[PDB]
Amino acid sequence: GLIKSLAEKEKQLLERLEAAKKEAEERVKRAEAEAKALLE
Amino acid sequence: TRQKQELEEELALAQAYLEPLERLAALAHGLDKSPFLRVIPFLLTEKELP
């Protein structure tokens, strides 16, 4: 029964998907900084 | 009187169900930390198995 293995694969993947999203939204918080600055 | 019935009822289910549940749980283990894979338990004896 492999089972354990593939039920680990779903964790790794989720935290890679998670990680993509996070750095993604960081870029948004980055464009927010310039958006104030460029006006200031 | 109620309590007595209830206790009996608990035991009856609990003994019967105990064996499939540990066995199924052992097979299932690693998916029952949070299904993110979806699982279906079922009991079958020899005939249904193919």
Phi-psi region of A33 (alpha: psi -120 to 50; beta: other; left: phi over 0): alpha
What Cα–Cα distance (Å) separates residue B31 from each residue in A9, A18, A30?
11, 19, 38
Phi, psi angle pair for A39, to nearest 5°: -90, -40
Q: Tokens 């039920």 label which residue?
A: A7
Q: Do A11 and B36 lie within an 8 Å CB cutoff? A: yes
Structure determination method:
cryo-EM
Put simply, whether B28 touches A (Cβ < 8 Å) is yes
Helix (H) and strand (E) counts in chain B: 1, 0
Give the integer Cα–Cα distance in Å for B3 and B16. Answer: 20
Put simply, whether B27 touches A (Cβ < 8 Å) is yes
Give the integer Cα–Cα distance in Å for A35 and A39. Answer: 7
Task: Decide: residue B38, CB within 10 A, 0-12 exposed, 13-18 middle, 19+ buried.
Answer: exposed
Cβ–Cβ under 8 Å, residues B43 and B36: no
